[PDB]
Design an enzyme around this catalytic site. Structure first.
Site, PDB file in Angstrom:
ATOM      1  N   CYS A 140       0.864  -1.178   0.000  1.00  0.00           N
ATOM      2  CA  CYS A 140       0.000   0.000   0.000  1.00  0.00           C
ATOM      3  C   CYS A 140       0.899   1.226   0.000  1.00  0.00           C
ATOM      4  CB  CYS A 140      -0.936  -0.009   1.200  1.00  0.00           C
ATOM      5  SG  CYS A 140      -2.098   1.371   1.236  1.00  0.00           S
ATOM      6  N   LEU A 141       1.212   1.728  -1.192  1.00  0.00           N
ATOM      7  CA  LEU A 141       2.126   2.855  -1.329  1.00  0.00           C
ATOM      8  C   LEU A 141       1.480   3.897  -2.227  1.00  0.00           C
ATOM      9  CD1 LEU A 141       4.690   4.107  -0.535  1.00  0.00           C
ATOM     10  CD2 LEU A 141       5.904   2.793  -2.279  1.00  0.00           C
TER      11      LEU A 141
END
Ligand SMILES: [Zn+2]
Ligand SMILES: [Zn+2]
Lengths: 144, 82, 105, 97, 54, 93, 96, 81, 108, 94
Positions: A82-83
């Site tokens: 999750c970036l």
DNA sequence: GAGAATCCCGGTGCCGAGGCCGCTCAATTGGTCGTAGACAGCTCTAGCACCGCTTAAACGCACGTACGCGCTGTCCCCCGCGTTTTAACCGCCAAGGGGATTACTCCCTAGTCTCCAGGCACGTGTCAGATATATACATCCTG
DNA sequence: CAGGATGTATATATCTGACACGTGCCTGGAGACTAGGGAGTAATCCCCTTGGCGGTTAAAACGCGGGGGACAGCGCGTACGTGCGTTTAAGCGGTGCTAGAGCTGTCTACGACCAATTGAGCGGCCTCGGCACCGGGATTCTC
């Protein structure tokens, strides 16, 4: 173009190898290997990654997933990361090595507000020592 | 009852400065009656719809939304009053 | 729970748009992508108007956007002027222009 | 002494009033006019201050637009003085009569 | 060289934020992809319309 | 206590995105709310008319895109449609 | 035997104000419609009724515009309509 | 492909239109202006008609589509359903 | 056999179909529910307006020594009446022509 | 095969009531149908907007009365309202 | 008055409108219940009304000057006409791309339930706009 | 051209009050779930569109000549902008009142709905007559 960008980035990476992180074609798919940065519960771990470059790269973010199990709020069991720079804050001017450095920084500082495994973020927020101990356990178990 | 003298309330200098905003250089003396006749017609048209909106609402006062709707139904939408 | 706007990377409330659509009696049933599309369109339009208004304000050496700035931004842009050609803005004034004939020669 | 030639004061008034956004009509006589007009549709009606302000804003915008159109018509007639012929022409063309 | 493609600037396009890149990469990444500056995020959509019309 | 709703918060967020260091008056915010409501009503009404014309019963992204093409002019419509398609694609993904 | 100028103009004004027929040739009008429509979608097809409706609307619009521009020309105290008159009429109507 | 069909609107046709409009005398430059005005009007109407048709997903423009396009411009037309 | 056929229009002495108006209203997505008297009122209004237009058109046709109403007659009837002209000022009628009038300035 | 609907029969009946010895062209009948549909759409839309404005959910005779007053001008509106009220009164009495 | 244009009376057909024949599909009846709407009642907020004081705006008058209006010469452009040229128009026929239906299936959307969190009503400080004024600064105008 | 007269934007200062900000709370959004029906898809039929042909001819194009009207000019009157001195209601503010707006709670008439019945309108099929047409007489407008 996209292949040209991949080759140019590979050439620059060869000319400018990072201290720990390393990646390369195994062209539009790369295998990435990063050492667990020191001063962290993951220090010493060797994490392997898979990279999938889109056909419109660098104008679209690449598909990269973790292949080494790790105890981190922002990484799930499937290796998803999750970036923001992977989803929203992507820029074509970015480099793969910059992505690796951002990954190392996120490993050093997890974001409990937007995690992929809520339980890991819960442990991180409620007991930092417990999070560090479990993260080191996982790093030794899967990344060492 | 309100007498008809109120139409004279729109003063000659007021009409002149309205024309100035509109970009008019000079004004003939006969305009000032034509302008207030036009204004009376326009106000009658808008208020007729406003009051019937209020009557259908079974109220005794005219709200701002009634005027907004009346203007909207004439293709004169007004922003700034909800 | 992740909001639909966050999923779409928007700012306008997709849920609110959906509720308004289903309460407005526009149709018996409403598709899934319609609120997303509509919210995106509204966000883009508001962004355009606000950008123009901010440029107008900074050109006027001020830091707050006012209805005068909104009116100037709308009237100066041809597309927005056409879109809102029959719209009156309170406290908006008019675009300053003088016919060249009236100017002295 | 000092005496501005005709026209200069008109031009500066145009510049001034095209730069401000204030209302150009007096609130009290406008209210009296509105109440006089509305009393025939239905007697003893009450109004909100916001409603009266909205009516005044709409009326002023309409008059300004009409004056722009009539000024264009007067210029088309190779003149600079607005006369009711121009207003009637603009009203007729805009389909208002 | 293009700030993105690094090839020789063919009809380079300069952003109002003083940033420039090649026209192919420009059309590929701003006109149809981002509408924001590839260097400093400077959004260029209104500028894009203004220069497209001209 | 009828909790009335507006778009002031989202408008302010958009303003922060566009000009990070610029404010907006309260009265200008009301004008933005009226503008948003007007545009929403226009688009929804046109989409409803399209659905009725095609004897459908569901409003999809197709109807909204067509209504946007009908309403917005030229490059404005082009950009709007591009944005809507992009948002729908991202939401589906 | 020649009529003074304007007399036949008045008689043909009376004639055309009484008939309801179309005043444009259907074939070139249809060619124009197709040529314009090329810019949006290629190889489109039209119904005869659609083309006739387009012609009706176009003729009505042009007749209304000519009425307005004649009125403006009369306001200018002359009887010959001019492109400035047409432009004034369109600008006042808000079409431009 | 085809081009220069706008000249199909003949000067006598424009003259007949003006005569029905009640015009007594016509300048020589009115014709190009009329050509341009009609071209703009037809472009505006046909764009909307084509949008309607392509939304309906068919290759034929219909009288109902033209009527809807006119209606959405405040130019209601009768006699076509 | 429940009752003899008495249509709502017959009850109201109307000629337009009250049932059809009601069905159109409830099928037109105009409101969640439709009141009882609304179709009756709407049918009455439509009948009155059509009667007015037809009366004017018939007068125009008889003034033209004709026995059938045509779009030209409808156009003349609408244009001559101020009320109907204002109601339908933005309406184009096929095969209608224009109201014959010439400006006095043009006449010699 | 779609069974389209129009008001041709009722228009013909009204025409016979008004002018018993007058015919109507086929193309004129289409014009009358379009006019009736346009008026119906205008009135229904206005009534729907009124009901929405008053936060109601039912379209009754009052909403149609107000819509008629909004649309029809002056004497035409007065006569139409009179006719509609009389029709509703007769229908209620029946 | 002569020449050209226009309406009408007259016989004809012919085609577009009026009446006939199922039958079926939409309008009607009756019951029933869930509920949107009507009514009563209470609270209170905003509109109405008034007083008084200030003064800036409105009003009235003189003038003179710039503009509107009328006259006149001209002349060039537009109208009327005729001859020539051409493309519209009508009829006809072949080809087929495409519009409208049927079936079906299935995938999308509505519905309900639970959870909560982001938006709304509410204090705050702090920071951008106005006021005042002394400047430059620009512009007019009369020399 | 130039310097005084005269507005006008500005830099500076402080007030000030409008807005960005942190706070408690609540309902509207998100989610898992299931059911059901809207429509996407294929295949089908036919039919309206496209294209073509050839033959007529009415309409368009060209050109010539003439006249009238648009236009530039000019002179003259007048009325409208500009300024100054004299009123006067608009605005403020302040007060006090109350009527109507908004709300909650009760009660109920009423519209949606289902099942069964039936007949009014749609399609078609005639029959005939309103009107376009071709010819000519009567009439009228213009030169
Ligand atoms: Zn490049
Ligand atoms: Zn930049």
């Amino acid at each position: 173009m996209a292949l040209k960008r991949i080759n140019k980035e590979l050439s620059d990476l060869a000319r400018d190898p990072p201290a720990q992180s390393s990646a390369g074609p195994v062209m539009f798919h790369w295998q990435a290997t990063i050492m667990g940065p020191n001063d962290s519960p993951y220090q010493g771990g060797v994490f392997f990654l898979t990279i999938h470059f889109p056909t419109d790269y660098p104008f679209k973010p690449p598909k990269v997933a973790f292949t080494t199990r790790i105890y981190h709020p922002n990484i799930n069991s499937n290796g998803s990361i999750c970036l923001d720079i992977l989803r929203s804050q992507w820029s074509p001017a970015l480099t793969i090595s910059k992505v690796l450095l951002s990954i190392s920084s996120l490993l050093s500082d997890p974001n409990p507000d937007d995690p992929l495994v809520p339980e890991i973020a819960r442990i991180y927020k409620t007991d930092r020592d417990k999070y560090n101990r479990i993260s080191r356990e996982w790093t030794q178990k899967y990344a060492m | 009852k309100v007498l008809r003298d109120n139409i004279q309330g729109i003063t000659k200098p007021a009409i002149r400065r309205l024309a100035r905003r509109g970009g008019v250089k000079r004004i003939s003396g006969l305009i000032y009656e034509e302008t207030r006749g036009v204004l009376k017609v326009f106000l009658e048209n808008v208020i007729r719809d406003a009051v019937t909106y209020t009557e259908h609402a079974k109220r005794k006062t005219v709200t701002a939304m009634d005027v907004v709707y009346a203007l909207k139904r004439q293709g004169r939408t007004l922003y700034g009053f909800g | 729970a992740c909001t639909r706007s966050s999923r779409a990377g928007l700012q306008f409330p997709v849920g609110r748009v959906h509720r308004l659509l289903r309460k407005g009696n526009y149709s018996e049933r409403v598709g899934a992508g319609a609120p997303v599309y509509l919210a995106a369109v509204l966000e883009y339009l508001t962004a355009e108007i606000l950008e123009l208004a901010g440029n107008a304000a900074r050109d006027n050496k001020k830091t707050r956007i006012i209805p005068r700035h909104l009116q100037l931004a709308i009237r100066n842009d041809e597309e927005l002027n056409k879109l809102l050609g029959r719209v009156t803005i309170a406290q908006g004034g008019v675009l300053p222009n003088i016919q060249a004939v009236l100017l002295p020669k | 002494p000092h005496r501005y030639r005709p026209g200069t004061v008109a031009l500066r008034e145009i510049r001034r009033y095209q730069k401000s956004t204030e209302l150009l009509i007096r609130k009290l006589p406008f209210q009296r006019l509105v109440r006089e007009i509305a009393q025939d549709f239905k007697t003893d009606l009450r109004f909100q201050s916001s409603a009266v302000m909205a009516l005044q804003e709409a009326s002023e915008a309409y008059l300004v637009g009409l004056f722009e159109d009539t000024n264009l018509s007067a210029i088309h007639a190779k003149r600079v003085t607005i006369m009711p012929k121009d207003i009637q022409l603009a009203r007729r063309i805009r389909g208002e009569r | 060289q293009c700030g993105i493609c690094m090839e020789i600037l063919v009809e380079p396009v300069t952003l109002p934020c003083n940033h420039t890149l090649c026209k192919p990469c420009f059309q590929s990444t701003v006109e149809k992809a981002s509408l924001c500056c590839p260097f400093c995020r400077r959004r260029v959509s209104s500028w894009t319309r203004y220069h497209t019309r001209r | 206590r009828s909790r009335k709703e507006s778009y002031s918060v989202y408008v302010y967020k958009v303003l922060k995105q566009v000009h990070p260091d610029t404010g907006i008056s309260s009265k200008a915010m009301g004008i933005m709310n009226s503008f948003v409501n007007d545009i929403f009503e226009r688009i929804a009404g046109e989409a409803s008319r399209l659905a009725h014309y095609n004897k459908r019963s569901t409003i999809t992204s197709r109807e909204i895109q067509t209504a946007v093409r009908l309403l917005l002019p030229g490059e404005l419509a082009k950009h709007a449609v591009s944005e809507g398609t992009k948002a729908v694609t991202k939401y589906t993904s």
